[model samples]
Target chain A: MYKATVIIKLKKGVLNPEGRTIQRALNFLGFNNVKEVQTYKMIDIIMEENEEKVKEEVEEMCKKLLANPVIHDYEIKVEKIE
Target chain B: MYKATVIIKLKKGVLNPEGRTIQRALNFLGFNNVKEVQTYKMIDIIMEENEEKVKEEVEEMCKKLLANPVIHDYEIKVEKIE
Candidate 1:
């Protein structure tokens, strides 16, 4: 069976207290590589194999139940069954 | 005073099929820049204020409620109290 990995994160305008603290720390470490840091969530899904068609349904899942599209964003990765 | 952010991830030995699938996708997408992609979980904890002795207490919290150290690894970052 194939599996999917989903990463969900808050969109840019939302207040991320935890992420702000991390940015501050990154600044302290002198690696100001990122101007800002935002926080979000990740959910991994294990499903059956080679289901490229499932991507649309999975995106719908993100919109309806997995994440709130208004403030959160999600990405999915799928693979073929062995 | 300070705040702390904690990130927790599974140990290397555990099976990471989702991670493997991502690596394969990255390879397929011609984005071969990343050699490996392992999946893990991140947790951020915000402390109102900081004290030198509190790090020990926080470690205790990690061991007690935050995570299972045996199969999971975690890191803590603290910043000066604002």
Candidate 2:
């Protein structure tokens, strides 16, 4: 079995309101060293496939549903598992 | 400077409706090899601090705001960045 970990995040130059909110909250909470904050969605998919195939399938899933390619960038890591 | 990446995920056995929804969607889309799906929140915080301090501050942020200790589990990775 393989597990694919996909991280979906906004591309550079994109506005992330949620991240901004968190940063603001952190600053209010006194951790003011924050320069920037970005948030991402990490989806872990477990599949009954080899690593190579799992990578391909997971990327397809992200492109088709998990991520919006125009505004979001994603990275997928597939690892062998029991 | 350092970048801290914090991944917040539901603890094992916690219900994940979002993950289940994605799995069902994938199944409906004809990707039948999927066994399970889990989703997480990854927060990237860029800080003007050393790696060690960044890690500590990020974890504190997660504890104070980013994650709920009762149900959410988080992992932090701090790396040097330009």
Candidate 3:
């Protein structure tokens, strides 16, 4: 089976409040090398082992349910089941 | 610079309520091919581009601030940006 990993992320420069807060918290935790922070949701879907079908179905979900219309975008990664 | 992607996921088989709900939502949304759903946080950290240091610092974050002590686990992916 193929497993598709979808990372639904915000558009660049979009104001991410919790993301910003997390950056502040990271700095507060003393890991200074951290320059930027971004947060998003990863909804992983596993189904029958068909790569093309997986991608197409995942695309439909992102367009329909998984991601917000324009504010958030999603990237897809497909992997074969080992 | 280096970009690091950290996916903090729940330990496999660790009761996933929202995950379960999402799966049900997928079915309701008419995507029968979608069999399993696992949700997680994708925290992208961009830093000074040091591979080793980036990993080390991220390890600390997962252990301390970013993730739950045991309930969740994290995976890292580091990529170099030209």
Candidate 4:
């Protein structure tokens, strides 16, 4: 079995409203002096198979369907867990 | 000043290609059983000011130039680090 961990973030010059909302929330929570907020996402996937084959399939998944090449770039790391 | 860590990831059903490419690389290296790969982005911002204000500015930065709301989601964590 293999586990894949991926992270996604906005490309340079893109905008994130969610970060702003969170910052606003912090302000309400009594935190001030924050100029802005940015956010990123992370996910972990588990696959049941050999590590080598798993790596290949997952790689195809990232390039063809997981990410938008124009807007964002991403990184994937795989390891044997359990 | 405050330090902000942002993590970006693909939403459910969204495909990740970057992950696939890397996974493929792993397969070349002898890892099998990989089914899918996801990618994520992270950014660290250093704000030179009060924690409160820094958080606000960082949030603004995200909404204005750090992330895209339509296709991606993110999270923000702030701490006082020297």
Q: Tell me the DockQ of each model, to 2 decimals.
A: 0.05, 0.89, 0.81, 0.21
Better of 2 and 4 by TM-score: 2
Please tell me which model should have the higher TM-score, number 2 or number 3. Answer: 2
Candidate 2 residue spans exceeding 4 A from truth: none
Rank by DockQ (best first): 2, 3, 4, 1
True contacts kept of each: 0.02, 0.97, 0.94, 0.35
Could you give the interface RMSD of candidate 3 in angstroms?
Answer: 1.2
Give every candidate's TM-score on chain A. 0.69, 0.88, 0.84, 0.72
Model 3: runs farther than 4 Å from truth? none
Model 4, runs deviating above 4 Å: A33-35, A49-56, B1-82
> In CAPRI terms, where does candidate 4 land?
incorrect
Q: Write the per-residue lDDT of candidate 4 for residues B8-81, one digit (tens) a residue.
A: 66665677786667556655654454455455666655445566665666676656655677776767777887
lDDT of each: 0.59, 0.88, 0.84, 0.64
DockQ-superior candidate, 1 or 2: 2
Q: Candidate 1 vs candidate 3: which has greater lDDT?
A: 3
Model 1, position A14: C-alpha lDDT score: 72
Point to the candidate with the largest DockQ: 2
